[PDB]
């Protein structure tokens, strides 16, 4: 069923709420237990997120390998995402020490510091070019090369260095900044235009290890971003686009970390940015 007539459909229905709980009813189980020892707990920013053993990203120590982020596989649409919860002041080295050891090329950050008057994560990045940050329990360094401030989003040019090897990369940095506290953006185009920003920069594609995604707690804006991305690649390779089914492929990636998609307001939006998105890219 073409989307955009299941969307009218569930508007004039008033059935939002309905269709959500559904697939909250649907979605997958299994264990979190290297999430719930008690060595970790202050490695989790909430009690009720928590990365699935099957999908977790393992940092390459053996004192400890923990840190709260899954690997998002899309088979057919062949994109790989890293999901994770904005770092606390305790791991922001372990962060670091993961988009080395996974070769990723970009990190995409959809939450500010603060909001709603709380912090949402901690100042992971350096501010000024010539105050780098050493992290010293895991061996690396990251200078601030260059920003580039726009009305809805800010990319960034950082140098990450191995100070155990001094091998260095290139970064990329893209933080949407104008996610409103409550609620969604009225309308999906700033979203898309920031969507399309990071993929013209190659950070997406298969020549660089898996995109770092994260908001405060890596499942609803970081949801939002994945699902919106993987529906409109699919919309280009399949014969029929009007065959992609968002609730299906909402499920497939639930299978990999609990709870994506927060809210039937956040399931609206998703359905609205792959509308517009699929129209611009092509049209019908
Ligand atoms: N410790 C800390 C807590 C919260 C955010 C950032 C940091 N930084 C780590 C590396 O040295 C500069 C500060
Ligand atoms: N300059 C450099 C040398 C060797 C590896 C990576 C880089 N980067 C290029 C872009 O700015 C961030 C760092």
Same mark, same amino acid.
């Given at each position: 069923?073409?989307? %955009? !007539? =299941?969307?009218?459909?569930? *508007?004039?229905?008033?059935?939002?709420?309905? /269709?959500?709980? $559904? #697939?909250?009813?649907?979605?997958?189980?299994?264990?979190?237990?290297?999430?719930?020892?008690?060595?970790?707990?202050?490695?989790?920013?909430?009690?009720?997120?928590?990365?699935?053993?099957?999908?977790?990203?393992?940092?390459?120590?053996?004192?400890?390998?923990?840190?709260?982020?899954?690997?998002?596989?899309?088979?057919?649409?062949?994109?790989?995402?890293?999901?994770?919860?904005?770092?606390?002041?305790?791991?922001?080295?372990?962060?670091?020490?993961?988009?080395?050891?996974?070769?990723?090329?970009?990190?995409?950050?959809?939450?500010?510091?603060?909001?709603?008057?709380?912090?949402?994560?901690?100042?992971?990045?350096?501010?000024?070019? %010539? !105050? =780098?940050?050493?992290?010293? *329990?895991?061996?690396?360094?990251?200078?601030? /090369?260059?920003? $580039? #401030?726009?009305?809805?989003?800010?990319?960034?040019?950082?140098?990450?260095?191995?100070?155990?090897?001094?091998?260095?990369?290139?970064?990329?940095?893209?933080?949407?900044?104008?996610?409103?506290?409550?609620?969604?953006?009225?309308?999906?185009?700033?979203?898309?235009?920031?969507?399309?920003?990071?993929?013209?920069?190659?950070?997406?594609?298969?020549?660089?290890?898996?995109?770092?995604?994260?908001?405060?707690?890596?499942?609803?804006?970081?949801?939002?971003?994945?699902?919106?991305?993987?529906?409109?690649?699919?919309?280009?390779?399949?014969?029929?686009?009007?065959?992609?089914?968002?609730?299906?492929?909402?499920?497939?990636?639930?299978?990999?970390?609990?709870?994506?998609?927060?809210?039937?307001?956040?399931?609206?939006?998703?359905?609205?940015?792959? #509308?517009?998105?699929?129209?611009?890219?092509?049209?019908?």
């Amino acid at each position: 069923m073409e989307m %955009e !007539k =299941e969307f009218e459909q569930i *508007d004039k229905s008033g059935s939002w709420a309905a /269709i959500y709980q $559904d #697939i909250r009813h649907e979605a997958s189980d299994f264990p979190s237990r290297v999430a719930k020892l008690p060595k970790n707990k202050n490695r989790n920013r909430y009690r009720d997120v928590s990365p699935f053993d099957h999908s977790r990203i393992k940092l390459h120590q053996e004192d400890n390998d923990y840190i709260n982020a899954s690997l998002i596989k899309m088979e057919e649409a062949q994109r790989s995402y890293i999901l994770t919860q904005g770092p606390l002041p305790n791991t922001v080295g372990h962060f670091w020490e993961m988009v080395w050891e996974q070769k990723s090329r970009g990190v995409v950050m959809l939450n500010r510091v603060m909001e709603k008057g709380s912090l949402k994560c901690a100042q992971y990045w350096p501010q000024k070019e %010539e !105050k =780098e940050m050493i992290f010293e *329990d895991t061996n690396l360094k990251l200078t601030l /090369i260059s920003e $580039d #401030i726009k009305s809805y989003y800010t990319v960034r040019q950082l140098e990450l260095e191995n100070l155990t090897t001094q091998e260095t990369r290139e970064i990329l940095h893209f933080h949407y900044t104008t996610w409103p506290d409550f609620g969604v953006p009225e309308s999906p185009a700033s979203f898309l235009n920031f969507l399309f920003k990071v993929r013209e920069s190659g950070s997406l594609s298969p020549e660089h290890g898996p995109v770092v995604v994260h908001c405060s707690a890596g499942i609803g804006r970081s949801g939002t971003f994945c699902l919106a991305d993987t529906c409109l690649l699919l919309m280009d390779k399949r014969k029929d686009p009007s065959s992609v089914d968002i609730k299906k492929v909402l499920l497939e990636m639930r299978k990999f970390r609990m709870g994506l998609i927060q809210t039937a307001d956040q399931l609206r939006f998703s359905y609205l940015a792959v #509308i517009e998105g699929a129209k611009f890219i092509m049209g019908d």
